[model samples]
Target chain A: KQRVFIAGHRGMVGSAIRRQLEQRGDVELVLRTRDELNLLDSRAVHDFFASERIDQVYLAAAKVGGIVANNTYPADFIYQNMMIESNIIHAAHQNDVNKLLFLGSSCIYPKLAKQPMAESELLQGTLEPTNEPYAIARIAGIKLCESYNRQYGRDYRSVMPTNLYGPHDNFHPSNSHVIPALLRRFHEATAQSAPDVVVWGSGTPMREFLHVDDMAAASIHVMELAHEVWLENTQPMLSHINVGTGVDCTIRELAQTIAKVVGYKGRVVFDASKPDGTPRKLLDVTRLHQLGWYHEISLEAGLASTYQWFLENQ
Target chain B: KQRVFIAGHRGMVGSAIRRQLEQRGDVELVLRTRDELNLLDSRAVHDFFASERIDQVYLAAAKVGGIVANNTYPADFIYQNMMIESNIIHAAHQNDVNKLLFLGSSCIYPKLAKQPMAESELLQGTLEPTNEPYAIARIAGIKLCESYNRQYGRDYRSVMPTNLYGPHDNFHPSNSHVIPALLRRFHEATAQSAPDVVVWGSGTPMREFLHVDDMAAASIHVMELAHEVWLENTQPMLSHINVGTGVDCTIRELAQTIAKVVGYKGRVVFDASKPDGTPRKLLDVTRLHQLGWYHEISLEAGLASTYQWFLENQ
Candidate 1:
């Protein structure tokens, strides 16, 4: 049986990945909570990797947050993310863990990237100012993986997923992402019998979103692809694969859908005065499909299931 | 007296900075050998900063090398540089050392950046494949400073210098930079009474070089600028200043000058079949001039002095 170690097993992405690995029943899974092991401590991580004899590492741990958190604590975002990635990658290599997968976000692409951003668009332009620090850390993570592979002949890889949302996402009114913020707003509105809810921005900007479960599934698929196939499809320098549905919906459509799913009758008002971010943000997942993995969840089904989970958890 | 810490004081750039700092009797300069303090160790770096009582920092430490070394050891380049920068920057912040100057290379710009590359061209395109890992780490260093400045209101800053050569530069026949490489070749030719020394490439590509001392002087000038003046000249986000003489010389011209400096009376033959790189690579120093600093060293004088040092050292 393969011995798999999933870092950040408590995160949404990590948890989703764990659920998939547990169902396989053929792999021995390893996990550590923040208290059990501090990933930021390089000596501790090194010791754990050396002693655990892990065969595969699912590197899903990261310091993730929305724009406000990113902006307010830019130092924390950049420093912590760099530390976590650098520590784990270095230790994994030292311990002879050849097969490892690093998780990244689509924000690694340029802020003004072409519609349907592809893996090729990375470092093609400047990043969004608000989260540039966080984006830089993730970009470094991908490069770190590619570097190890080129230098040590390690089977390290990276996957950059588009906006992901599901059960365990943050739902704070001010700090949440578009989907979770809207879901909570609509749920509260329905309970209060409110007449209208104000949505930020013009609501015309298009964006891509993938369910966390689909992201997890894609991660595993990429991790397990034949080594020859992976090498054939990737260049040493441009090795990361983009994961998404390759489809996008506008803000108005998404908010409307969220209201319907949350059983709210209130009208959703678009605040035109607020900023509309990039005109369109989507990921081109052709490389992913070529690797024999496509997202399996539709937007509606994913949203309904996510709403059910959120309600039950709340 | 200001207590200053100069990391990597043994390096070419750091040594130049050290020479300058030593002349300033008003400041107490602090330094540590790599053996005395392992910069890669986060705990060691943090404790050192906490105990040093440092008022200023010159963060010039890096895992730097030529193209061959970079490609051969990409993982070392990325991992060590990221760790050194992250550990020092974060620890400096934690210990309340507010003022800092981060030194980076022009390689941080995109590979196909426009002629006379401006500071604005950073992250505008992909970096050259050979040293990309090193470049990414340097780029992250700039952002690390900017992020800390934005979030914590720190006075951290960065400077990206063009190709630099001087006393401490590598003179290895194969691994050295253009100036030192050509200098050594011509010196050997003269000593052996050879008729000609064949140089690589067509000798048409234009490049810029700054004396390490001039780079050091510019760095000190930027660091000592009044707070208001520095802030007026740079944006909080796009804050890195580019340092160069605002002039470039053709490869042929550079070779001729090196020959003259070495007292070599031999023909410098260009191998036309070899590849000439980008037609020109320069840096826009308009911002540097506006901030009231300009290079005082000329190419001929700088090359001559460098040759003198190389002769004595050799």
Candidate 2:
């Protein structure tokens, strides 16, 4: 008897959540586009929640972008995200909905968060300047969830995932992330029979990437955690969980893996002169693993499938 | 040629601001009560700003309370305050209200911030847990102001004041600050001619207090700062100003002064076993002083005037 509402069903993570939940075949899904229900409208959100029979919510809707976007429209990013979160979370409480899942990003952690960022890393230092506004909004969202759960006995949880890539991803040439960008780059190299695919940076940094499908699975698993178990592991204020494959890979290995998946024979060259961002970025998923929700997908297999989908969808 | 809107006109600081502005007698003032216009409603806020040709804004409205209230209704504190901020700040930008002053509290600083906290102290460490929800919202409010100014070329400034006490202070017995609580306690002691008034803690901790009138004036002063001057003193993201007396006195001195102001000759006893909260809490006014605003009312004079208001208002 589960009826779920996914707020950002058009986005990659939201679509993945919706797709996996649909495969379950037991729960009814409620999806809305921006035109139908703007999450930024407080009264409209309140009225919708008040009038509907929503059992749970997946708050994945957000105004997201790369560095350029965050830097250019800081106000839009912060103000709109905070409004979306405050509207939905507050309205959910007002309507007496007991359970919710807020989708957070890895950016919630400190810029120099220890090798593998944990829930405790939040607010420990200043955030990266480009996305500070965005990080602040998501941080506020986690607190909103914690406060609601603490004050009203609601089961509002937050999950901050590591980098995600898979089907329905933004494969745009300019604004996409590393995985999609590399996937597209290698695919084009393979198609054009080019000599090599040139990647930026020295390719020495380590990073964790989780397939979107696995993320969707982990989300459902966390959502279905026994209330007693959740209370035992998470404190009232420190309740957010990190979602990722506990293992990480060097960018060199990642490029090799993508080359194999995409059938690109060209040598993958690292541009040593370019900036190599952080030496490492990963989510500490020890707690999640202990909670009995380890990620199932491996890098090679997940990348192969994602490349196939990219070829078909491209 | 300045038209002003004060968002929270009935509370201590807001009322103080309205009173002082009324004394100015030149600019047009706009005030609204909760029923007249709810600040939490985004659409209503937008409509108000869009319909009226307002010139500037004093975003002083907030859902505020003491530790007990904050702890119990954590969600309400965070959600309502954030909604109010996002709603008004976004609407102000939409309606072309370039200049707005967001009133903030010193609690926005870290829990273990240096003795005299400064603008540079924000988000440097974890916030105090008790009022964190409120602090986070105010922090978000500051960021909202900063982002709006940066993106839209608006003039939204923030000022975080030290411990404030004056006329219209919250005198509730259980849910008031140290100043009002002491004022009421010593006043009752005087009425009953008690032998002594036992104040909590050892009375050795150092604290700072600014009169509400001074805070209102500082708010106006910062609001009216020359654009070049404000730009010279502040960074875009680190834009909030600290308003305070920039001087501190021991709690013993404060208790003794309050007794004199209340005309209570009774011995002010310090309960040594009581918790002495933090040893020292003050705000650095170097940047603010350099920017040309300082607290004019001394602790004793402000206390006497507040006592007068208490006697009349009570």
Candidate 3:
């Protein structure tokens, strides 16, 4: 069996990838949590890679957060992320683990980027200030992958997912992303017998969402791709491919779906007077489609399963 | 008295800053060589800042190189530079060091940046591929400084200098920059009693050069500026300032100045058939001037002093 290590086996997407990889008979998974081995410790991380003789890496580790946390701990956001990415990526190279996939965010694109942001849109303009530190770290991660590929012929890859939410994602009442927030609100509302669940802002703004399972599937597809197939579809320098539904839904549609997923017989009221964010935010996954992969799990199905997980966990 | 730590005290600009700071009665300098303290070691770096009670920082340390080395060791270039910046910046913040000045290069600007590139040109477009990794690390450095300031009110500042030359510059025949290459060639031509020293390309391309000592002094001036004074001429987010002569000279003029400085009694010839680089490359130092600092050394004078140092050291 191949020795494969998932660097962040406990996070949302990382856990998803782990679940999929667990079914594989050809590969053995090497896993470590922060308590067992800290990714930020360069020496410790480097030694693990060497000792394990790891042949593949799923570099899903990151110091991620929502806008408030990102902004409030800017140094922590940038520094920890950079160190994590650097330590693992470097360790992989030194220990001869060439096949790796780095997980990044859609925030890597500019704030004013085109509605459907493409790989080429990176570094084209100023980023939104709130998550600029986190975005900078992700951008650096992509560049680091490209550099190693350029210099050492390493087969490191990167996937920048649009908005990943599923099992293990943050579900804090005040800080979670729209998906988890909606799911939780509706789940609890049913129990409390609330007549309606109020969501912030107008219902017209469109956004992309990719279930963590679909993201993991896309990543694995990209990683296992034939080298020739990859090169034909991607530029040597602009190598990262976006992973997304390549489709979007307005807030009303998303809220309605959440209400259905939670089996809540309540209305999802959108306060039109409240602010709507940018009219649309999405990823241009043309590169991914061209490479022969698209998101699989539908929003409704993904949400239903996630709500199930939340019920059991809670 | 203030205790300031110069992270890269052995580098060209770092040593120059050391020389100037040695003249200060109100400040005590803390120095370390790589053997004494490895900046790439996160724990070691964090411990140093805590134990030393460091009040300020001068982040001039980096894994710098020419184009070939950058391309040849892209992984080394990006990974080491990222580690150095993240480790030190995070250490400084955790230990309550409230002030730092980061050193960056003109390469941080876009590849096709407008002539006389300004500080605002960062992330405006794609970077030159040859040094993309190095530039990414430097860009992260500036952002790291900005993040600390935004979140913790730390006064960490950044300066991007253009084509700096003089004292401790790489003079190896195969891998140095324009000024050092010219100085070494002309100096050797005099020793060999050659009739002419041939330089590449048309002599019409204009370039900028600042003495390392002047680069060092500008760093100190920016570091010591009052918060009110700094805010007066800078954007909180785009706070970095450019350092340079704010003037450029043609390659022919640079050669002539080099011949005089090195006392090369040989004629200097420009091979016009060879490619001349961009017609002009200079930094927009309007911000530096607005910040109440300007280059004091002339091309001829800076060249002369560097040649003197070469004679003594070489």
lDDT of 1 by residue, A66-116 (tens): 877888999889999999999999999999999999998887888898878
User: lDDT by residue for model 1 over B20-84, one digit each (tens)?
Assistant: 99998799999999999999999999999988899999998999999789989999999999999
True-vs-predicted CA distance for residue A288, candidate 3, Å: 1.8
| TM per candidate | 0.98, 0.97, 0.94
What candidate 3 gets wrong by more than 4 Å, as runs, is A190-196, A263-267, B263-267
Tell me how many residue pairs clash in candidate 1: 0
**Cα RMSD of predicted structure 2:** 1.5
TM-score for candidate 2: 0.97
lDDT of 2 by residue, A123-226 (tens): 88888989999999999999999999888899998889999999998776565488888888888889899998888889999999999999999998888898
Candidate 2 local lDDT, B203-288, one digit each (tens): 99999999999999999999898999999999998999999987989999999999999999879999998898789989999989
DockQ of each: 0.90, 0.85, 0.77
Poorest stretch of ten by lDDT in candidate 3 chain A: A167-176
- Cα lDDT computed for each candidate against the true fold: 0.92, 0.89, 0.89
lDDT of 1: 0.92
